[PDB]
């Protein structure tokens, strides 16, 4: 491996050999000349040192190259360590048929599918393209086939679309911690440069659609293709192999859509309408009623598998809403209606999927997951569902609670000045009263957010659950929680941890009304602590996993 071409300058494997060879030659030609004992013993000592350094450098002494203080890599150093032979032999090998790209979302896709760019394809499948071209008689010779593939002709594109058809390809997220980091899909050729991934499998892959990349590997033997179809297919990884809960569950922008479409509000357009159930979609789409209409009576034909291996119908006239009546179209046969006739949060649809899998089987539950994703995505967009400054409201009692807490703090400080209370007791009381004030503020803020006032049946007074965007999202569980809302409308709370302790004065402000320089500087210790904790615990978790796998 020459550097400048003129001189090869072999290093780190031939320097030690050269040292040993020349020193041994000198000792051998000095041994037969009746050399003095001191000289011959000294030469033997240097020969011993040279051989020891060749076999292992770091153990005794150090041998270094010119202009670099780094030692040489002896024979053993290329066996042990993370840069040794085994850890490149232990599947540390690179692979031939592989490709990368940035991950992109494709919502039109179904569970057993992915979007593979045409530029990336026709390169991973090039031997197959050559084989098909030779078989169909479009290129009598390998050179002609190569030229035709290099020119990228329409026949080449048709042949690629033909050969890629029934051929699974498997994707792999870079940190693969459990089994589901590798799944096999059916490639669909897209015009672009980014791999399109399925939102449902994003949760298993732990992908986040911000610069994440994904590797592609092609199985070519028949056993490998059948294996990717029958063991690694993403339509076979329904349940988690760790605990047993389903690994596919709508999580975001679908939970919100289903929650919005299945909700009840009084005095909506078309309250008293009675219909058959197919008519709810015709009534929402054209005119007449809103998907939030109440007291709507629709006749639902349930199917229950009461008989052994056979299901029978049952027709009723249960009251429901237009949105639930529409979603009943998506819901399959064997499932009942009580699982739909509700507000349908996130755990509700997770239970829906679990019941569908347990009762019907695998194919109905896969189809149900796909249809749920489609309908949730559609209605979330159709709902508008924006966010604004006025969306998060601050309770009016916050000022009075802050004033009362400050007054009690002043009273405690006066008592401490009087000498009746010592420092630790005063600190504990201050913390207790501030925590109580924080809890009261949070309770008042939730009180304001939860309840809304509306007019029903000309009564002019009604209290039904609000339609605030932040409250709706938190309640549905799509994204966020009441604890995180507390920091947007209520107070930040104590938010104090220099190393372990707690500052007596808490942050009394939220992000809607801004923050002070002192408060914002105080609130950075926890952020830095958490970021450092993640960045220096990832490696420890990886090492624990490695030891577990090696021992078991």
């Amino acid at each position: 491996v020459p550097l400048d071409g003129g001189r090869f300058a072999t290093s780190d494997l031939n320097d030690l050999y050269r040292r040993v060879i020349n020193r041994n030659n000198r000792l051998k030609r000095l041994l037969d000349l009746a050399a003095p004992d001191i000289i011959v013993r000294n030469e033997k000592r240097m020969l011993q040192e040279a051989v020891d350094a060749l076999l292992d450098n770091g153990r005794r002494g150090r041998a270094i190259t010119g202009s670099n203080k780094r030692p040489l890599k002896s024979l053993a150093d290329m066996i042990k360590g993370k840069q040794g032979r085994f850890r490149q032999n232990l599947l540390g090998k690179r692979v031939d048929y592989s490709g990368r790209s940035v991950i992109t979302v494709g919502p039109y896709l179904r569970l057993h599918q992915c979007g593979l760019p045409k530029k990336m394809a026709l390169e991973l499948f090039k031997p197959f393209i050559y084989g098909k071209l030779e078989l169909r008689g479009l290129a009598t010779t390998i050179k002609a086939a190569k030229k035709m593939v290099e020119r990228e002709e329409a026949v080449v594109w048709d042949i690629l679309d033909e050969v890629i058809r029934e051929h699974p390809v498997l994707l792999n997220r870079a940190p693969t911690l459990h089994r589901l980091g590798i799944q096999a899909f059916e490639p669909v050729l897209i015009e672009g440069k980014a791999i399109q991934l399925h939102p449902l499998v994003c949760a298993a892959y732990n992908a986040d659609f911000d610069g994440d990349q994904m590797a592609v590997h092609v199985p070519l033997t028949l056993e490998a293709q059948l294996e990717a179809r029958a063991l690694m297919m993403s339509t076979n990884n329904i349940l988690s192999p760790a605990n047993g809960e389903p690994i596919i569950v709508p999580s975001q922008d679908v939970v919100l859509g289903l929650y919005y479409m299945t909700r009840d509000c009084v005095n909506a357009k078309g309250e008293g309408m009675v219909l058959t159930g197919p008519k709810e979609a015709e009534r929402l789409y054209r005119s007449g009623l809103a998907s939030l209409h109440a007291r709507v009576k629709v006749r639902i034909t349930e199917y229950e598998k009461d008989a052994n291996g056979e299901l029978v119908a049952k027709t009723s006239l249960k009251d429901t809403t237009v949105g639930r009546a529409i979603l009943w179209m998506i819901v399959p046969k064997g499932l009942p209606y009580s699982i739909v006739n509700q507000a349908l949060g996130k755990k509700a649809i997770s239970k829906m999927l679990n019941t569908c899998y347990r009762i019907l089987g695998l194919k109905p539950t896969v189809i149900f997951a796909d249809q749920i994703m489609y309908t949730g995505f559609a209605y979330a967009a159709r709902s508008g569902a924006s966010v604004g400054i006025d969306d998060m409201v601050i309770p009016e009692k916050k000022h009075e609670i802050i004033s009362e807490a400050e007054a009690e703090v002043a009273e405690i400080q006066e008592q401490f000045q009087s000498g009746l209370v010592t420092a630790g007791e005063r600190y504990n009381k201050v913390i207790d009263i501030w925590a109580a004030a924080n809890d009261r503020v949070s309770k008042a803020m939730m009180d304001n957010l939860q309840t809304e006032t509306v007019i029903n049946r000309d009564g002019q007074e009604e209290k039904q659950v609000s339609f605030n965007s932040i409250y709706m999202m938190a309640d549905s569980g799509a994204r966020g929680s009441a604890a995180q809302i507390r920091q947007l409308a209520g107070m930040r709370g104590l938010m104090a941890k220099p190393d372990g302790s707690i500052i007596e004065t808490p942050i009394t402000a939220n992000f809607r009304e801004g923050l002070n320089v002192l408060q914002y500087f105080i609130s950075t210790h926890g952020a830095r602590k958490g970021l450092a904790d993640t960045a220096l615990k990832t490696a420890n978790s990886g090492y624990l996993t490695r030891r577990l796998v090696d021992v078991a």
């Binding site: 400048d4 066996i79 032979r85 490149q88 232990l90 599947l91 690179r94 692979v95 031939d96 490709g99 990368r100 790209s101 992109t104 979302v105 919502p107 530029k119 390169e123 084989g131 078989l135 440069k193 980014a194 939102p199 610069g211 590997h217 033997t221 056993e223 690694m232 922008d253 859509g257 995505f377 559609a378 967009a381 709902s383 508008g384 569902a385 604004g388 400054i389 339609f467 932040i470 938190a474 994204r479 966020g480 995180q484 809302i485 220099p498 500052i503 004065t505 809607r512 801004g514 923050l515 320089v517 914002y520 500087f521 609130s523 830095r528 602590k529 958490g530 970021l531 960045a535 796998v549």
Partner: protein, 1341 residues
């Protein structure tokens, strides 16, 4: 009233309530002030080269009576300019030459000098010179040297106790850190014994270091301990007890005092008893004999008659020994006190542990530690011990070290010596014992009063000193050997060692790295970076968990936001806006003095230590007109615990709200409404933005963009300018007015802009003029706009019209939906420039040549090549076309009839040459911007190399003749004026010069002499012009010197325009990033009631979970600003009168609370309003300070002025169905920026390529079409699936199974899909490597 003629074009509205007191500093002082003082001629030798020389320059021969000194050093003038260095590839530096003095003196005379050789100076190396931007041009590439943050030399009493002790006991050690030399550590053991440790090696007993300093047991005892008299005469056995001095111990029995007994037997000691014993004079009181057995003797007592060693020092008294020592030795015996409660010996227990009692046996112990063998011979051990610590030229810590040492030991004096001292050692040990017993507090390493910063100049000085101390040895040797000579002072002064040391430091170092070049913000924040790693401090990113936290003393000194979020989080920081460096290197920050309630304008800089005493108020505190406080109770910081204080306790107040944030985090609008994590991420992602074609200002800013753009040095600012004469796409010339003009110059300032040059990141750097002809320009006004700058403001991104709503799942998690209009209008389009080079590399067969006579190639390939063989400028090249036609000679053609026939038939090829041409790498396409060719001296091929030469020569002639033309015109005007009223009209002078007819008037007055003098001056000017032109031509055509092998170099640059597409990564300023998932046609994109479609659709499900209310506030403010701009645009389109437009602009400028006074119709004329309105017609620029921004009420009010809904929401319609969305949506204008992670550089695919010679595996990470890495976790996944066949396939067929790869390829092409696994090659390599050791290994059957 602010004129600011460059700013008067477009005034940015400010929402700043607080009044600014201190203006933002230079923002790049830390990088260039240190280097300026590094090479500054100082009359007194304190820092720089003057201090580096005076250290070890006086050379004294080994009793040779011949010395060497120096007079002064002078810095040479640089050979090339910065632009010349960058275009060439050489380093920017300046030669160093110092006048020396070698004096030889004769023998037998005390200091009798006979000859001096102080007549010639020697050049010793070149110092790389710093440019105007705090950056170096080392080897043609711009590099920045980061400052370091390490622990200041001194003494630190750290605790190092807790769980690491593993005994439930606290320890107290002490370390003395010098700036140079060895370290000294004084630990403690759970046995309450102290040990001395050097260089963190094996420990030693406590008092060996004391005994080495000619100290005996008696002095050590009397110095460390206090000895009581213990006067026991005539068997009285009485004790001189002082209750004030010693007390707190219960009396056992037989205790008496003056008058009544002090304490009854068996009674607890009481404060009343102590007070009574102190009030009454207490003489020597008797105690039982039990108190003697436990007590130890202070000194060694000797009997009066004989001198036996009875009662040895540090020995407990015995009852039997007591009688004989009282009878023979003496009566009063010196003893100790040794009370556990408030004291502890901790040394007398160690004295018996010492194996050595004499200094003789003690001195060799340190030698035994230092060197294992070779015992000393009474000349080595003493010399080593004296040279280790107490030598001047081997320890020499610092002035800072001595200052910290004296401050930590309560010493008034600050001026000390770099040598340690015995008394210093005893003080250190005494204070260690004091802190162990309880006398003070342990130190804190994270405290910014214990850590100092090292800038580039001082590390350069240290490296130069290290390089000079090496050549000093050679000079001394050459002066000692063969001293009988009178040669010039170059006996051993070799510049190569010093130059090699300085080049090694500057070029290849950990703290010297390529500067970021994709943003002015990125550059200006790389130059202010502070790192803890490097040659010192923290050796690795590991070994730290509380070092990387936000210490409370980081308030106005380092930023708690800007830091990377990777492995080195917390080890990389950025200075705040106002943070300055102390005299010794610590960090300061400015405050305003508060005197008896009022707040003065004066500014005091306080370091970390000083700020801990005074009570500093808060910047967000109300202020009266006179400087008084509104509220009696104000929030302040006292010692790290902020609380409330009255107005009579405060002493200082902060300067501005931007004081705690760096320059990166001060560009984020509404920073106080964002979480710390998201603010950190937004600040970190702002630096990665890549500039686009058309720069667009932000409608929502903070006011720091102007300062950042000006101070980044990326624009072209006008120095001493008055008016513009000629404006061009690449040249600006300014006619400086006479007010700012000094005699002796033409009066023309010329600026040559930088057009389309490659950056470090392969981006584009382009400057565009802003001024027009005849536009008056003041001093400090910008003239050009660098990358991502708009009229002198930092503009990195575009104002996109965002909408917050889910859209069919195309913005699912962090994906973005972008309208097609964004792609059509060429927003976010980016220009990228690459560098390709080829060398000739002459051979023994013959030199290689670029002649375009390339064999085995078609005429189509050589269509784009010139006669010389290199591409035409402007040609488009894709894939694998030829750029430079190079041929390598082969061996001589053989006499063989076959080759003879081939030569006779074809000729001109003879297989003499081989096609080793430079071709474009696969998947690279672009158009050639310009080429550059370099030919070494002595080679005059120059096929077409003269064209660039002539272009440069003509440009130099054009830019050099202008000043001469101006001077000649002035002289001609002077002649025409002095011939007035002399009978000669100006018509003759205008027609022909004629040297004013050679004074045809012949008045014999001063006129003739005046004409002669003017003719002489004109001749001198012409001669100067010719000399300058010849000098420029000689500097231009002189030729380059390259590497010995290299014969010539040709470089080719290609420019590529990259557009937006799915996969590309966008971002905001609030830590929100994303990947484009779709480019939606304009028809489908949601539209409002006026038919205008939004540009970008974003997911509203990130705001409540990431706490980014800054996004929402920014969109509302941007919507208000765009509404104002739209109203102004409509009024301009209606061609309305000036009065109404001016009144509307004034009403829009005066809106809000009391912030800033600015009024039209009194400074702006009728015309300036037109250009102001035409500039701010695409939106009203708004500036909200960091923590003093606009309020929600003011935003709602501003929305009302542009006739917009104050709620911020608006009804939208679906573009595909025309059905109105319920729950009205939020639209606005967010500043979106495009990051440097493009999908064009991310995709890679491979089927079969080139493997490595060893292990036969695919290469790697796109290194020439490499493969991808299956790993241990991936094989674990496959095994968990049970994928035996896929695993075997990935193991063998796709990898080093050499005989199986070809078989699988053949079977795939034939349509078989079958595998022949075989055996991997890496296992064979492993077997061979194991057998290369004496270990037999094989496979059985």
């Amino acid at each position: 009233m602010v004129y600011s003629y460059t700013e008067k074009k477009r005034i940015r509205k400010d929402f700043g309530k607080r009044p600014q007191v201190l203006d933002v500093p230079y923002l790049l002082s830390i990088q260039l002030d240190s280097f300026q003082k590094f090479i500054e001629q100082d009359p007194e030798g304190q820092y720089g080269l003057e201090a580096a020389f005076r250290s070890v320059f006086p050379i004294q021969s080994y009793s040779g009576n011949s010395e060497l000194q120096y007079v002064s050093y002078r810095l040479g003038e640089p050979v090339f300019d910065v632009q010349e260095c960058q275009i060439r590839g050489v380093t920017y530096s300046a030669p160093l030459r110092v006048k020396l003095r070698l004096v030889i003196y004769e023998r037998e005379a005390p200091e009798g000098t006979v000859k001096d050789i102080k007549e010639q100076e020697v050049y010793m190396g070149e110092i790389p010179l710093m440019t105007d931007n705090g950056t170096f041009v080392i080897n043609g590439t711009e590099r920045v040297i980061v400052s370091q943050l390490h622990r200041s030399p001194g003494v630190f009493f750290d605790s190092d106790k807790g769980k690491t002790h593993s005994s439930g006991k606290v320890l107290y050690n002490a370390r003395i850190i010098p700036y140079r030399g060895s370290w000294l550590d004084f630990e403690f053991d759970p046995k309450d014994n102290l040990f001395v440790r050097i260089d963190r090696r094996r420990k030693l007993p406590a008092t060996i270091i004391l005994r080495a300093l000619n100290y005996t047991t008696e002095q050590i005892l009397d110095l460390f301990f206090e000895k009581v008299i213990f006067e026991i005469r005539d068997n009285k056995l009485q004790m001189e007890l002082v209750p004030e001095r010693l007390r707190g111990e219960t009396a056992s029995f037989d205790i008496e005092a003056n008058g009544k007994v002090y304490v009854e037997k068996g009674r607890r000691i009481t404060a009343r008893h102590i007070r009574q014993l102190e009030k009454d004079d207490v003489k020597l009181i008797e105690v039982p004999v039990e108190y003697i057995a436990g007590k130890v003797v202070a000194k060694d007592y000797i009997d009066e008659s004989t001198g036996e060693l009875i009662c040895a020092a540090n020995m407990e008294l015995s009852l039997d020994l007591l009688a004989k020592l009282s009878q023979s030795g003496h009566k009063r015996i010196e003893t100790l006190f040794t009370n556990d409660l408030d004291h502890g010996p901790y040394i007398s227990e160690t004295l018996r542990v010492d194996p050595t009692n004499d200094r003789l046996s003690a001195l060799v112990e340190i030698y035994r530690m230092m060197r294992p063998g070779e015992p000393p011979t009474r000349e080595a051990a003493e010399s080593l011990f004296e040279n280790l610590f107490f030598s001047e030229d081997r320890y020499d810590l610092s002035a800072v070290g001595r200052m910290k040492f004296n401050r930590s030991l309560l010493r008034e004096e600050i001026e000390g010596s770099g040598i340690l001292s015995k008394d210093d050692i005893i003080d250190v040990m005494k204070k260690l014992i004091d802190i162990r017993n309880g006398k003070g507090e342990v130190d804190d390493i994270d405290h910014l009063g214990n850590r100092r910063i090292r800038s580039v100049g001082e590390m350069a000085e240290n490296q130069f000193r290290v390089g000079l101390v090496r050549v000093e040895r050679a000079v001394k040797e050459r002066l000692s050997l063969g001293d009988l000579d009178t040669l010039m002072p170059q006996d051993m002064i070799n510049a190569k060692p010093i130059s090699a040391a300085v080049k090694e430091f500057f070029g290849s170092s950990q703290l010297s790295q390529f500067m970021d070049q994709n943003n002015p913000l990125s550059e200006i924040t790389h130059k202010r970076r502070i790192s803890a790693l490097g040659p010192g401090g923290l050796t690795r990113e590991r070994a730290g968990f509380e070092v990387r936290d936000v210490h409370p003393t980081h308030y106005g000194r380092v930023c708690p936001i800007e830091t990377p979020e990777g492995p080195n989080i917390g080890l990389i920081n950025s200075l705040s806006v106002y943070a300055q460096t102390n005299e010794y290197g610590f960090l300061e920050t400015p405050y305003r003095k508060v005197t008896d309630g009022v707040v003065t304008d004066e500014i005091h800089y306080l370091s970390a230590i000083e700020e801990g005493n005074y009570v500093i108020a808060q910047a967000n505190s109300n202020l009266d007109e006179e400087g008084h406080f509104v509220e009696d109770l104000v929030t302040c910081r006292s010692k790290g615990e902020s609380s409330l204080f009255s107005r009579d306790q405060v002493d200082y107040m902060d300067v501005s709200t931007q004081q705690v944030v760096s320059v990166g985090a001060s560009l984020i609008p509404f920073l106080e409404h964002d979480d710390a994590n998201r603010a950190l991420m937004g600040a970190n992602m702002q630096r990665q933005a890549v500039p686009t074609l058309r720069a667009d200002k932000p409608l929502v800013g903070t006011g720091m963009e102007r300062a950042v753009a000006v101070d980044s040095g990326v624009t072209a600012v006008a120095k001493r300018g008055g008016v513009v004469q000629y404006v061009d796409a690449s040249r600006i010339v300014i006619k400086v007015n006479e007010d700012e003009m000094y005699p002796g110059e033409a009066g023309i300032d010329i600026y040559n802009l930088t057009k389309y040059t490659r950056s470090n990141q392969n981006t584009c750097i382009n400057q565009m003029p802003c001024v027009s002809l005849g536009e008056p320009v003041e001093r400090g006004d910008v003239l050009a706009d660098g990358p991502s700058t708009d009229l002198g403001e930092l503009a990195l991104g575009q104002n996109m019209r965002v909408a917050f709503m889910p859209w069919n799942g195309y913005n699912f998690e962090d994906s973005i939906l972008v309208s097609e209009r964004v792609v059509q209008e060429d927003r976010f389009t980016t220009i990228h420039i690459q560098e390709l080079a080829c060398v000739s590399r002459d051979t023994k067969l013959g030199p290689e040549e670029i002649t375009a006579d390339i064999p085995n190639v078609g005429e189509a390939a050589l269509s784009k090549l010139d006669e010389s063989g290199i591409v035409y400028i402007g040609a488009e090249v894709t894939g694998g076309d030829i750029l430079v036609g190079k041929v390598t000679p082969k061996g001589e053609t053989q006499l063989t009839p076959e080759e003879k026939l081939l030569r006779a038939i074809f000729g001109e090829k003879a297989s003499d040459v081989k096609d080793s041409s430079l071709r474009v790498p696969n998947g690279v396409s672009g158009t050639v911007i310009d080429v550059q060719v370099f030919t070494r001296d002595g080679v005059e091929k120059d096929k077409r190399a003269l064209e660039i030469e002539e272009m440069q020569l003509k440009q130099a002639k054009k830019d050099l003749s202008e000043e001469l033309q101006i001077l000649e015109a002035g002289l001609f005007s002077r002649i025409r004026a002095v011939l007035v009223a002399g009978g000669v009209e100006a018509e003759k002078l205008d027609k022909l010069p004629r040297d004013r007819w050679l004074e045809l008037g012949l008045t014999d007055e001063e006129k003739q002499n005046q004409l002669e003098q003017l003719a002489e001056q004109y001749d001198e000017l012409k001669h100067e012009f010719e000399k300058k032109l010849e000098a420029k031509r000689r500097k231009i055509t002189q030729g380059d010197d390259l590497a010995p092998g290299v014969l010539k170099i040709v470089k080719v640059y290609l420019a590529v325009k990259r557009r937006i597409q799915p996969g590309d990564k966008m971002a905001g300023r609030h830590g929100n990033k994303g990947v484009i998932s779709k480019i939606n046609p304009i028809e489908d994109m949601p539209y409002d009631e006026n038919g205008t479609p939004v540009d970008i659709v974003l997911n509203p499900l990130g705001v409540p979970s990431r706490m980014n209310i800054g996004q929402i506030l920014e969109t509302h403010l941007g919507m208000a600003a765009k509404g104002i701009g739209d109203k102004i645009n409509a009024m301009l389109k209606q061609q309305q009168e000036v009065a109404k437009l001016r009144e509307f602009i004034q009403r829009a400028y005066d809106l809000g609370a009391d912030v800033r006074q600015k009024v039209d119709l009194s400074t702006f004329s009728d015309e300036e309003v037109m250009r102001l309105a035409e500039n701010l017609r695409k939106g009203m620029p708004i500036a909200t300070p960091v923590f003093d921004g606009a309020k929600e009420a003011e935003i709602k009010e501003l929305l009302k002025l542009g006739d917009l809904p104050t709620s911020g929401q608006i009804r939208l319609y679906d573009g595909r169905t025309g059905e109105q969305f319920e729950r009205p949506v939020t639209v606005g204008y967010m500043y979106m920026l495009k990051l440097n992670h493009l999908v064009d550089d991310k995709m890679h695919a491979r089927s079969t390529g080139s493997y490595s010679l060893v292990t036969q595996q695919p290469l790697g990470g796109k290194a020439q079409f490499g493969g991808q890495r299956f790993g241990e976790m991936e094989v674990w996944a496959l095994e968990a699936y049970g994928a035996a066949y896929t695993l075997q396939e990935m193991l063998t067929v796709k990898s080093d199974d050499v005989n199986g790869r070809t078989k699988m390829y053949k079977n795939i092409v034939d349509g078989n899909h079958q595998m022949e696994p075989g055996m991997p090659e890496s296992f064979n390599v492993l077997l061979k490597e194991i057998r290369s050791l004496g270990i037999n290994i094989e496979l059985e059957d």
